[PDB]
Amino acid sequence: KKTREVARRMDAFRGELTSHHPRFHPASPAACKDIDIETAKQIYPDGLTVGIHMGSWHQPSEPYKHDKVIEDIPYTEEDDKAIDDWVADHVET
Amino acid sequence: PEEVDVIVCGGGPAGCVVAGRLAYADPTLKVMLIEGGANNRDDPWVYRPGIYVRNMQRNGINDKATFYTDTMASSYLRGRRSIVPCANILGGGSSINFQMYTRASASDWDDFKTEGWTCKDLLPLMKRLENYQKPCNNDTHGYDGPIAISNGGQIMPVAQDFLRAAHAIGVPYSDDIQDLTTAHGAEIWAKYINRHTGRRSDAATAYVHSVMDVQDNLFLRCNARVSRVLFDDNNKAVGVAYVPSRNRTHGGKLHETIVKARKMVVLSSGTLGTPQILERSGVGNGELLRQLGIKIVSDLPGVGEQYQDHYTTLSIYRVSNESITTDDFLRGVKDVQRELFTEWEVSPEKARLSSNAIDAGFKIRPTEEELKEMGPEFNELWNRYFKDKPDKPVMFGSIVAGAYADHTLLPPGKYITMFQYLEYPASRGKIHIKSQNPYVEPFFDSGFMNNKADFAPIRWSYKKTREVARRMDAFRGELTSHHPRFHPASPAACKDIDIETAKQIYPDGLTVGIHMGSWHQPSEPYKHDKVIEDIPYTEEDDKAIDDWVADHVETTWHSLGTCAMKPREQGGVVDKRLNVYGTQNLKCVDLSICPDNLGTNTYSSALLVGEKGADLIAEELGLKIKTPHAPVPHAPVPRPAT
Amino acid sequence: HGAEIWAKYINRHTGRRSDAATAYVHSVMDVQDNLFLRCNARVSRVLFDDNNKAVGVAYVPSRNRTHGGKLHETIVKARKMVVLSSGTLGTPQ
Amino acid sequence: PEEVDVIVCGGGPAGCVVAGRLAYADPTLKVMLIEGGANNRDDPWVYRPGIYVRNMQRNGINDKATFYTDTMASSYLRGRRSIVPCANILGGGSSINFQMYTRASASDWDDFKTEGWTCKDLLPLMKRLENYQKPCNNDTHGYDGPIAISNGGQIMPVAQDFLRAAHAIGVPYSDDIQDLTTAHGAEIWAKYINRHTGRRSDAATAYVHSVMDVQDNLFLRCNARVSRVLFDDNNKAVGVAYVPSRNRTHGGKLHETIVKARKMVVLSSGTLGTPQILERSGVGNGELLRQLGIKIVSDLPGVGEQYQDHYTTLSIYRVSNESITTDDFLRGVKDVQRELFTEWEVSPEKARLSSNAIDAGFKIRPTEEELKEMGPEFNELWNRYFKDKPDKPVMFGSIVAGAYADHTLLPPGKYITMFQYLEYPASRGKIHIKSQNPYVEPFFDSGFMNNKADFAPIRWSYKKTREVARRMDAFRGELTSHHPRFHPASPAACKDIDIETAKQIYPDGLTVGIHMGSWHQPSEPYKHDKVIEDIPYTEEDDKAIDDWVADHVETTWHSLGTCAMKPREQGGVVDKRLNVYGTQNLKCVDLSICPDNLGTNTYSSALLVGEKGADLIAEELGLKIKTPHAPVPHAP
Numbered sequence A: 001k002k003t004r005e006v007a008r009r010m011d012a013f014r015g016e017l018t019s020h021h022p023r024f025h026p027a028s029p030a031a032c033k034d035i036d037i038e039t040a041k042q043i044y045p046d047g048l049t050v051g052i053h054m055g056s057w058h059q060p061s062e063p064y065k066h067d068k069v070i071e072d073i074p075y076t077e078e079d080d081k082a083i084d085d086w087v088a089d090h091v092e093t
Numbered sequence B: 001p002e003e004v005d006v007i008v009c010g011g012g013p014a015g016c017v018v019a020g021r022l023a024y025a026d027p028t029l030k031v032m033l034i035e036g037g038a039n040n041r042d043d044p045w046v047y048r049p050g051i052y053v054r055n056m057q058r059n060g061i062n063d064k065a066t067f068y069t070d071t072m073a074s075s076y077l078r079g080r081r082s083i084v085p086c087a088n089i090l091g092g093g094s095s096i097n098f099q100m101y102t103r104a105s106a107s108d109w110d111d112f113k114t115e116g117w118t119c120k121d122l123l124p125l126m127k128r129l130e131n132y133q134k135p136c137n138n139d140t141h142g143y144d145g146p147i148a149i150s151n152g153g154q155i156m157p158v159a160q161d162f163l164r165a166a167h168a169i170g171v172p173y174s175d176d177i178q179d180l181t182t183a184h185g186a187e188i189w190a191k192y193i194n195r196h197t198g199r200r201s202d203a204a205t206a207y208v209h210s211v212m213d214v215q216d217n218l219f220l221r222c223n224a225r226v227s228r229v230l231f232d233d234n235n236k237a238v239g240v241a242y243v244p245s246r247n248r249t250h251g252g253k254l255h256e257t258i259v260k261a262r263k264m265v266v267l268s269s270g271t272l273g274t275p276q277i278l279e280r281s282g283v284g285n286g287e288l289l290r291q292l293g294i295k296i297v298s299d300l301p302g303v304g305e306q307y308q309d310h311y312t313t314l315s316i317y318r319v320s321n322e323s324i325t326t327d328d329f330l331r332g333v334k335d336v337q338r339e340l341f342t343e344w345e346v347s348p349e350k351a352r353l354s355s356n357a358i359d360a361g362f363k364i365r366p367t368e369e370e371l372k373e374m375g376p377e378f379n380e381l382w383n384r385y386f387k388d389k390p391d392k393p394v395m396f397g398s399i400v401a402g403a404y405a406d407h408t409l410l411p412p413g414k415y416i417t418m419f420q421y422l423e424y425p426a427s428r429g430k431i432h433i434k435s436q437n438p439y440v441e442p443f444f445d446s447g448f449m450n451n452k453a454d455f456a457p458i459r460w461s462y463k464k465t466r467e468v469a470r471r472m473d474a475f476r477g478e479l480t481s482h483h484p485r486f487h488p489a490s491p492a493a494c495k496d497i498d499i500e501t502a503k504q505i506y507p508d509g510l511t512v513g514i515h516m517g518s519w520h521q522p523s524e525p526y527k528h529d530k531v532i533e534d535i536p537y538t539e540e541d542d543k544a545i546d547d548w549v550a551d552h553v554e555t556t557w558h559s560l561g562t563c564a565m566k567p568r569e570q571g572g573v574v575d576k577r578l579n580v581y582g583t584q585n586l587k588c589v590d591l592s593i594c595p596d597n598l599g600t601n602t603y604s605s606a607l608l609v610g611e612k613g614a615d616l617i618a619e620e621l622g623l624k625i626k627t628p629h630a631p632v633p634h635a636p637v638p639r640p641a642t
Numbered sequence C: 001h002g003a004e005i006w007a008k009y010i011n012r013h014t015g016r017r018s019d020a021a022t023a024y025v026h027s028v029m030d031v032q033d034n035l036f037l038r039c040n041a042r043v044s045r046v047l048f049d050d051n052n053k054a055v056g057v058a059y060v061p062s063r064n065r066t067h068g069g070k071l072h073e074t075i076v077k078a079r080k081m082v083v084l085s086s087g088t089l090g091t092p093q
Numbered sequence D: 001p002e003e004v005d006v007i008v009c010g011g012g013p014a015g016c017v018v019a020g021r022l023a024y025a026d027p028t029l030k031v032m033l034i035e036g037g038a039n040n041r042d043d044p045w046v047y048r049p050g051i052y053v054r055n056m057q058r059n060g061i062n063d064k065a066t067f068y069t070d071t072m073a074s075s076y077l078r079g080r081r082s083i084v085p086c087a088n089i090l091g092g093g094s095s096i097n098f099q100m101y102t103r104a105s106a107s108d109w110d111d112f113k114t115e116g117w118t119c120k121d122l123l124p125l126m127k128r129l130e131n132y133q134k135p136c137n138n139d140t141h142g143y144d145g146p147i148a149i150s151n152g153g154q155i156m157p158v159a160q161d162f163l164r165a166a167h168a169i170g171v172p173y174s175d176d177i178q179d180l181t182t183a184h185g186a187e188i189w190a191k192y193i194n195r196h197t198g199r200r201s202d203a204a205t206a207y208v209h210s211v212m213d214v215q216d217n218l219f220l221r222c223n224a225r226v227s228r229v230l231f232d233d234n235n236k237a238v239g240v241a242y243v244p245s246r247n248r249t250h251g252g253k254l255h256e257t258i259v260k261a262r263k264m265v266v267l268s269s270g271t272l273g274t275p276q277i278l279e280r281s282g283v284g285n286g287e288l289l290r291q292l293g294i295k296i297v298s299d300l301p302g303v304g305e306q307y308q309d310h311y312t313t314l315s316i317y318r319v320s321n322e323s324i325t326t327d328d329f330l331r332g333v334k335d336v337q338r339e340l341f342t343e344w345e346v347s348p349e350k351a352r353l354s355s356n357a358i359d360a361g362f363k364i365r366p367t368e369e370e371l372k373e374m375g376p377e378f379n380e381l382w383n384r385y386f387k388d389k390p391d392k393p394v395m396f397g398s399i400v401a402g403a404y405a406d407h408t409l410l411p412p413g414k415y416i417t418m419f420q421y422l423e424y425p426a427s428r429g430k431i432h433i434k435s436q437n438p439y440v441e442p443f444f445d446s447g448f449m450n451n452k453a454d455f456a457p458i459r460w461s462y463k464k465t466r467e468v469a470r471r472m473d474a475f476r477g478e479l480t481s482h483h484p485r486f487h488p489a490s491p492a493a494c495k496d497i498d499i500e501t502a503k504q505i506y507p508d509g510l511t512v513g514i515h516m517g518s519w520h521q522p523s524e525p526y527k528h529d530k531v532i533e534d535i536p537y538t539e540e541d542d543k544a545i546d547d548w549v550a551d552h553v554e555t556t557w558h559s560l561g562t563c564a565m566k567p568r569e570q571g572g573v574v575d576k577r578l579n580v581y582g583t584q585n586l587k588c589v590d591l592s593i594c595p596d597n598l599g600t601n602t603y604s605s606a607l608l609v610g611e612k613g614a615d616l617i618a619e620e621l622g623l624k625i626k627t628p629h630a631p632v633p634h635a636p
């Protein structure tokens, strides 16, 4: 939770890699937000696929704003459980 | 001019049929087609098939679609606001769709319970529109129609891979799954592509531009959003008011031009645009029109109700690197696009781009054995809807030779996706306007999954299409990221990419095979001699799949039923000849009129609605529809041939 | 005893291979509805009568990939004739 | 050959119609066509539509054009000398032009005030020349003529962008602005390009080369400059004397070859070429000839007077980098050029190069409201000329999907230009020879803007075309450098490229967004939701546009009126049959003869005049014209 709060406040931050993060309930305010649309289009500028909602695999981040005011991700007991399972699944030497 | 005989509002399939037929039937009949979208005439981003996928990008550039978002979060989809798109271009869907050739089963049409719309009444019209350019073992298709149907220039090796695996799990092969009779079988899947020219068979160029090339009485007005229909004091349609596409006049300020109709006004703006036109014109829910300050012409509460669709899911799988897929073309790899564009130009009749890469599939139907596992609320639907209706499929399933997903969210490598949709959903939505003003977004609601019966078949499908994936030659694992969130220790959990396959993607990569993270469980390397057994699922694995459905179920752009053809006292909007109740000289002919769903990709159905409308309008104006239609631009000079 | 420029099963005009399927079968299948093609189907054995008449045929998949490895024969019957054209190696078996 | 029946001088469209129609009416009729420039037959730099832009380069390599420069400097154009170029190739303008299909309004022809030149009288001849290969909702166009017309291989996405924008400022869409009737409307704009072959509809391949393939009576002498018309004791035209294109003889010494005409001598050397031929033959202003020591044959002072043109202005705008435009092709980016040339060779029917990329536009006409904002002197011309002539447009406006402008003076990125011209100028000019020599330049005077009424409409256009550009999706800014010098704090002052578009251009560049110098006022980045309101203009702003008009106005290559068809006592030069006054067997059939302007791109006009001249020589020689013409090479 703490390293997350550092990520969000960095200038370079463009989103959480949803695939590789805890399994939050999608409607939970603690859910991941993956790459934003303008950053996506830069990766594959000639691509036919960029910005296709279909599959709803990711909630895209908002495009970056240097003036953004930032507040902490609130977490519930259920979010805590998602992270506990995430730790169980992914903790390593 | 300012005055014509027939106005057609919206140039989708149905509206192109109607406009085209009628203009060709009588050169003296002055008819105008008004289309919100742009002209699609000789646009290489329409007529080339293989670029279809780009048409659904919400990327700032693409304006060939308008996108309707749910007004309010659905609890049924665990919070998300569903997105339904639809066409914003002449030819409507037909200019931008997947180009999958599918037909509804015979019983679907009968079940409209409307004289003139039996399978037997429509079969001749069904044939009238087709120019079937592929072998089949029956007499169900037409050979002098405007709309070319084919296997396209090149079938992808995975097509037959997919078929072998379908056979492996007891779904039988067939020549023709679109013979009106089949609910349980697998085919090579045809396309709305011309075998010879390699061009998308769009309704506009088949029925409209064809006539415009040889007569002066068809008028086209694109980039014209029909505001509303103008009415008599006796509720006869007199004409139509349209505004510019872009709300960009001096001050964002409304500028209507009016055009008048002597004989007929046809609304063909699709399932989402027609009810909107009716509502702001004065036809719809009286309470809703009162509140918006619109004078009532006809109180029809069904206008905008009983919205129906097919409900898509997209299971993605990783495949071998030697496998042929569209993934590197869709990423915009330079020399791969250069090669496929060049190939299409020099020899369209064999070009990879003369395909939609959806080269195989099936319609399927569950066993008695399988129905027991599907729960109480589907078994209610089954007994009441499917039980003694054996030509109706429950799910559709097809293979794309490449991921149909934002590749900005996919790992590198090649994929295939199992493109699935529920065929006759129980769930329902609605769509109502929120203003007179034609630029303000309507209130919207998909309705996806609000009936708990729709989960079981979509769950069933996922397991079934997985068993097919797991038994292919090309299969190298499931994309964990895009699959249900099973317990990692569950036998039903995913197995992602092979170490071997992975080392081929990035042979100088430093990170390939670093365990650190345990982000995926790797599949054991492909073995041709492998013995393969069904995944056993548990009640907990089932919940995970339902969750997956709630989170990733989507439209199939097969919207219908917002202007249902049934009695007024039942909530109908049109009589058996598509006249709008309460009015004169106004017809709705598009998919909005369907009182019930069809087990098909619905371009076929829309054209059929189109033709049946053309008929109905012709016998009211005492006109004879010419066969064959005007010759289609670029087509070769045309009974079955090679 | 003699030497020539050696000809090929290739159409001079189209550049294409003169394969037998396209020349005899696909030609017909394109113009008529009476020729049925079942590919990816391996014939097990010719079903026989009590009078040792050929009545039909049992075919299986090409890939051996069912659930328990269990053989899935489908049967297609014959009013008039069974012909065996599975080649020097295929026919005898 | 030393002697023929007809001699047509200059292989412009009119000349090509005349030479081809006559030779094909009567295979006995020995007709020779003499052309100052080179033969255009099967030249890939003539028949490929997409390379047209190169033909106006002053780079000491291109020679498909002669350039006339005003002898003196014009006060009215703030001291510059106007450059009017014209064609120097077989096919003339038809081999090198923008290939824009436009037709004049009905009243334009009626207003010639001549029997046989009514709209009515010419409409059948209009249909004779056209092969119309696009849809329309009228019966105004021909379908079996030599000259193929179409929307080309591929319309550019900015076409319907421009229309959507035009609509939003109250110019209505129409299926056909070339219906002789429309003066205020906007269409997809057609081109002199064959739909099926992707080749340019040049007059020479259609009318002349078609014939020369199938008969032996049509003779072609290219690279040959007609000096003078040889005359009889009774002012009958007996022949013609020509010299080589280049003056590369031993000792620069003159070399005339002579060729005699039994029946007729036709002049089709153009508005600029024709009068010169008359004057050094001894047909022109009596005094001017006296001083140059040329024996007078017929005193016609109006030879070379009443030079009319259409007055072009070019408004450049910047657009997005995802826009599709001609700019990289025009710059010479080899693999852009290689991709387009190759695409044209494999499939011309849908190639980007089977086009002129001037894919939409409008003819426009001012409201009552707008008239007030214009001058006293234009309101005067409005009453005298346009008020009871409602089928005449005041200005033409079109979109080029690219920058028609020296790219050596353009920043990087993509452009579109608003190509605008004045349909009927009040302003007038003249051309006269300076010598008996045909190699010397004549005295020239564009006459652009010497009439103050001509400013207001052009100023009006700039404003109007700007409002269109600003309402487009592709729009990312005005090119400050090539726009009027507005006061920087004026609400009308330019806004240039926005930062997001600029970064896209040079994403590894160290200099993008350095404010230092304050050389431009950046636009704010593109919003699809942006509400838009007209630029207001003050009197100072209007002065800045007037001056910008004076500084940057050009010919549109639609030159006419220097051998005019009216009564001789009104300074006319020709009969109602196009016979030169005071001569026998001599006709001008080209655009020189026009007594007044035409609200059109004048290729259509020159062809029609040609078709009409062919009729007039056909009945005078008791010939009958054949329909259809000789099949045109490479056509289906």
Ligand SMILES: Cc1cc2nc3c(=O)[nH]c(=O)nc-3n(C[C@H](O)[C@H](O)[C@H](O)COP(=O)(O)OP(=O)(O)OC[C@H]3O[C@@H](n4cnc5c(N)ncnc54)[C@H](O)[C@@H]3O)c2cc1C
Pocket: B009, B010, B011, B012, B013, B014, B015, B034, B035, B036, B037, B055, B056, B085, B086, B087, B088, B089, B090, B091, B092, B093, B094, B096, B097, B098, B099, B100, B101, B102, B224, B225, B226, B227, B268, B269, B270, B271, B272, B273, B274, B276, B277, B556, B557, B558, B559, B590, B591, B592, B601, B602, B603, B604, B606
């Ligand atoms: C992305 C996509 C994929 C699909 N996949 C397939 C497939 O694989 N196979 C298949 O057979 N079919 C497919 N279809 C389905 C098929 O194309 C549609 O069902 C069909 O287009 C329905 O025809 P329609 O006339 O009823 O509506 P539409 O095709 O949607 O046409 C309606 C037209 O009305 C215009 N319009 C709407 N409102 C207004 C207004 N107020 N004023 C003016 N104009 C208006 C729109 O611009 C549009 O052109 C798909 C469609 C899409 C968009």
Ligand SMILES: Cc1cc2nc3c(=O)[nH]c(=O)nc-3n(C[C@H](O)[C@H](O)[C@H](O)COP(=O)(O)OP(=O)(O)OC[C@H]3O[C@@H](n4cnc5c(N)ncnc54)[C@H](O)[C@@H]3O)c2cc1C
Pocket: C041, C042, C043, C044, C085, C086, C087, C088, C089, C090, C091
């Ligand atoms: C690599 C190669 C090179 C050759 N070179 C030449 C050459 O240069 N020139 C030349 O003229 N000829 C050449 N031939 C020889 C010629 O092709 C064959 O001898 C000829 O094709 C034999 O035809 P066939 O009807 O006996 O059977 P085959 O050609 O062997 O075909 C029999 C078919 O039966 C199928 N089959 C087998 N078992 C079963 C079963 N249980 N159920 C269902 N189907 C089955 C097989 O898949 C096969 O498609 C070559 C052949 C090969 C393979």
Ligand SMILES: Cc1cc2nc3c(=O)[nH]c(=O)nc-3n(C[C@H](O)[C@H](O)[C@H](O)COP(=O)(O)OP(=O)(O)OC[C@H]3O[C@@H](n4cnc5c(N)ncnc54)[C@H](O)[C@@H]3O)c2cc1C
Pocket: D009, D010, D011, D012, D013, D014, D015, D034, D035, D036, D037, D055, D056, D085, D086, D087, D088, D089, D090, D091, D092, D093, D094, D096, D097, D098, D099, D100, D101, D102, D224, D225, D226, D227, D268, D269, D270, D271, D273, D274, D277, D556, D557, D558, D559, D590, D591, D592, D601, D602, D603, D604, D606
């Ligand atoms: C760059 C350009 C752009 C244009 N844009 C358009 C457009 O967008 N749309 C459109 O419809 N029209 C356009 N035109 C205008 C149109 O082409 C001309 O108005 C038309 O070609 C004039 O025809 P003409 O027969 O009167 O003379 P010209 O076309 O000028 O031909 C005259 C010919 O006579 C020859 N000649 C001159 N002097 C002599 C001599 N002494 N001896 C022998 N031969 C001589 C020349 O070499 C030339 O070939 C344009 C022209 C040019 C050059």
